[PDB]
Structure 1
Amino acid sequence: MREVISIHVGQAGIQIGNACWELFCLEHGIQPDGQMPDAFNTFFSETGAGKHVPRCVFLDLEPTVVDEVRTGTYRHLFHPEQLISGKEDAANNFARGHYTIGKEIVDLSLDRIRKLADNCTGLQGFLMFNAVGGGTGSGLGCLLLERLSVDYGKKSKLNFCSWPSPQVSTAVVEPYNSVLSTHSLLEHTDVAVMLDNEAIYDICRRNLDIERPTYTNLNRLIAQVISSLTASLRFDGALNVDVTEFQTNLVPYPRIHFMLSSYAPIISAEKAYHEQLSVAEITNSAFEPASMMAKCDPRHGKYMACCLMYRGDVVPKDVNAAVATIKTKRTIQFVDWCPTGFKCGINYQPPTVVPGGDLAKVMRAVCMISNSTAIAEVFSRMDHKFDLMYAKRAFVHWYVGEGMEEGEFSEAREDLAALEKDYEEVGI
């Protein structure tokens, strides 16, 4: 009965979703045509002839990145109009994905979201993938989250942001789109998870010994994190943490809901067999201030909640003793209104490896998703990005050109300034 709809929006949303559904089909046994040769109803339905279709709704305004999926090997996997396309892109413009042409794709995407939710008995989360700092993953992502809240009350809407890296961006309007995105990923999102591309670049170099990773290797690390996040939801476990558990043990206030994730048996095939990847070893590497998948050192903040997702042949006494060890560690600082901050979960099914991927077979896993008063430097870093640009009205004549009110930039700035004041006062 348990079931999650994934909604992959944008170029980065689709390309991450290609890695996710590639890993999910290789993990539950579904071939690229749909047939396998009931631990699948969280991500797949059943047509009746042994046929399994993924439960995903792809979105883009370009047709280029989504025509790729319907012409490659995973075309008979998806239902042929799940892959929802437009004609022309918003062109890295938030107002062009919100107040203009992405208003005719929204009524067809919500058409199929309803068709993919009424054929499931009990929905527990709208997993959502976006690329905040762009045109369609920001503009259409903002309008989609507002529309999903008004139509589907409660019904916790997860999100895996692709927030721009602090010191490298590959745009200049990327300060504008991310600050304009805080009016969606703050009051419509519950599970706003912050992922920066630079941090997972550094993970690939320092751990996997890949000095030149491509975006596909970036998405393969993210897909293993989401599989371990839904691991208890699909497989049996000694301690199951479903979505309802997640928004009680990791979110203290409805506004402070921003998390950082760090998987950490992320070991290359050459270096996997020279250490035992024991439970204490993989969680000591999980709390390192370099494996965090946003560029945000937790040592200059204060942890308020941690949700660890030990997965594999992990004995609960080794979970418990490792949590005791990291509690003894002085490098991390838990906030004074938090005697216990260590929601743990155990799933017996070990993490899988894609054949020809960049990871290795590992018996254990840790997915560490935590909230801290260190993410304030992430939003305050693009605070400096915005006010350097908006000081004399850069690139605003092409946001107000298509209908954005001159001034919507300003309360996006006091929306980021509101959460800046909130993170500092929950650490005193």
Structure 2
Amino acid sequence: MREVISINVGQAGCQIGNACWELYSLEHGIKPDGHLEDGLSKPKGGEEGFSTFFHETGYGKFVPRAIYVDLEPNVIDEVRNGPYKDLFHPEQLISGKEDAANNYARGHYTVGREILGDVLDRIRKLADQCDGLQGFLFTHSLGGGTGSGLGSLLLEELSAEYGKKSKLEFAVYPAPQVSTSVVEPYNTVLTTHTTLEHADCTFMVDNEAIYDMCKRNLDIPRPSFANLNNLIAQVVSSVTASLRFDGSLNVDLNEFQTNLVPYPRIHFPLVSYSPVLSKSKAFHESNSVSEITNACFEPGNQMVKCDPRDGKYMATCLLYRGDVVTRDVQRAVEQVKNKKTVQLVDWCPTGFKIGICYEPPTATPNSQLATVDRAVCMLSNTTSIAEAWKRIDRKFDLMYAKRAFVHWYVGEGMEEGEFTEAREDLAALERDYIEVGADS
């Protein structure tokens, strides 16, 4: 539609969120100081570029609509000392004086409610300046207390105030193999209990899968968080690419919740970025239509630690960008369906929503990605996603059978029976995820 509000909370929200606006300023040619140098008109930085995400103010300046809410001052204060300190408004940064650590109870009842009364005022004043608000954008991080506690608390208060808004979410699910926290599965079951009954679409990404997409594909010897945030930023830019530019098949955010989420529940799509090529092998690739299309279903280019070949596909959504042929898109997808590996359901006769985009994307200078001529974004919904949810439940049953970390939640303001209701709601979702997918 028009403007889209972006909200970044948690540790991963403030880090990955800075990489999203860095790519947006490069595609639209926006100066990091807050000017319109190098751009002028054209869809790559004109009337169709200033709308959405960004906002036009006065004195030739353009500020975004990002709201950074973190319960740790050691992250927000670091962004102020960086080069991207003149983009967002200084009043949009709301810091805290009490670190919630990685506990879900403190960031939802005690510390989470201290700043809850102040974050709702910033969203209300920002929504009034949007001439026709479309939806929202969240960036969660399942594994802590700020990105899980404050994120689930803000989403509940925002869904009750508005309602009919495309509330997108790019949460980060824990890796089924190597973990980074001890009470990580505790913050995962409690987060999905309120996310399913409020959010409309939650794109999941795995930190372990990105390490495989950079060591074997990009051949990066020492990858860090500076490169993981660039791959996720290209996924968010590919979804809203049809709205911020032009193309043959314009895809709105309201269409992602219809052709992918037919039921009131089950709205956990995957992501598999295909244009993954290093600078050393940039002259040894054809970048054809059928070559990039076949690389989407490959497990090596998937940002989620899951095996889609063991499951079945329910609803896919491809986003073709750059300079592609409309006829070549319908022919490349038909060859994949005839491989007898996708396993399409009986009710849906097609289920391959395409999205042709005419504006070619770009890459950040702090990465090994070159300027490609086309990009394909895969947003499918497979039946093997319940396998990753089963591994998280097995780690929660072992810690709950003997009461491992329980006093840290009850002593703050959470009933012991809440873990039983959250586990039953998660088990009922996994049970209905296989029963419906077996005969869909």
Under a length normalisation based on structure 1, what TM-score does the superposition of the two structures give?
Answer: 0.98
Per-residue CA deviations over 1:70-89 (Å, capped at 9, x if unaligned) read 12111111100212211122
Percent identity, aligned pairs only? 71
State the alpha-carbon separation in 1 of the partners of residues 405 and 334 from structure 2: 52
Structure 1 residue 362 and structure 2 residue 365: aligned? no
Q: 1:7 corresponds to which letter in structure 2?
A: I
Contact 1:278–1:364, Cα closer than 8 Å, also in 2: no
- Out of 45, 48, 64, the residue aligned to residue 54 of structure 1 is 64
Of residues 95-104 and 81-90 in structure 1, the stretch that sits farther from structure 2 once superposed is 81-90
CA distance in 1, matches of 2:373, 2:252: 22
- Aligned ranges for residues 57-206 of structure 1 at < 5 Å? 57-206=67-216
Structure 1 CA distance, aligned partners of 2:4 and 2:273? Answer: 21
Q: 2:398 aligns with which of 383, 388, 396?
A: 388
Opposite residue 80 of structure 1, the aligned amino acid is P
* Aligned pairs (5 A) from 1:387-406: 387-406=397-416
Q: Partners in 1 of 2:121 and 2:177 — Cα distance?
A: 39
Residues 7-52 of structure 1, C-alpha deviations (whole Å, 9 max, x = no match): 0010101100010011111111111111011122111111122101
C-alpha separation between the residues in 2 aligned to 1:44 and 1:307? 26
Corresponding residue of 1:14 = 14
1: distance between equivalents of 2:93 and 2:300? 36
Match of 1:326 in 2: 336
- CA deviation digits over 1:61-115, x for unaligned, max 9? 0011111111211111110021221112211001111011121212211111112
- State the alpha-carbon separation in 2 of the partners of residues 49 and 274 from structure 1: 47
Whichever residue aligns with residue 120 of structure 2, its letter is: L
How far apart are the structure 1 equivalents of 2:392 and 2:379?
23
Q: Does 1:217 align with 2:227?
A: yes
What is the Cα deviation at residue 57 of structure 1?
0.6
* Count of paired positions: 428
2:227–2:366 contact (8 Å) kept in structure 1 = no
Q: Could you tell me how far apart the structure 2 residues matched to 1:387 and 1:114 are?
A: 41
SS in 1 for 2:353: strand
Say whether the 8 Å CA contact 2:112–2:153 is kept in structure 1: no
User: Is the CA contact 2:322–2:358 (under 8 Å) kept in the aligned structure 1?
Assistant: yes
C-alpha separation in 2, matches of 1:270 and 1:364: 19
1:268 aligns with 2:278: yes
Letter in 2 for 1:376: A
Q: Give structure 2 stretches of 5+ with no counterpart.
A: 38-46
Partner of 2:44: none
2:43 is matched with: none
| C-alpha contact (below 8 Å) 1:307/1:368 kept by paired residues | yes
How many Å separate the matches in 1 of 2:400 and 2:167? 32
Q: Shift of residue 285 of structure 1?
A: 0.6
Give the drift of 1:329.
Answer: 1.6
Match of 1:40 in 2: 50
Determine the C-alpha separation between the residues in 2 that align with 1:400 and 1:228: 42
Divergent runs of 4+, >2 A: 355-358
RMSD (CA atoms): 1.1
Distance 1:332 1:273 in 2: 31
SS of aligned partner of 2:437: coil
> Any conservation in 2 of the 1:90–1:97 contact (CA below 8 Å)?
yes
Give the residue type in structure 2 aligned to 1:15.
Q
Displacement of 1:418: 0.9
**Distance in 2, Cα, partners of 1:167 & 1:258:** 20
TM normalised by structure 2 equals 0.95
- Mark the runs of 5 or more structure 1 residues left unpaired by the alignment: none
Q: Post-superposition shift, 1:335? A: 1.8
Q: Distance in 2 between matches of 1:293 and 1:185?
A: 21
Shift of 1:384: 0.4
- Give the whole-Å Cα distance in 2 for the aligned partners of 1:207 and 1:336: 35
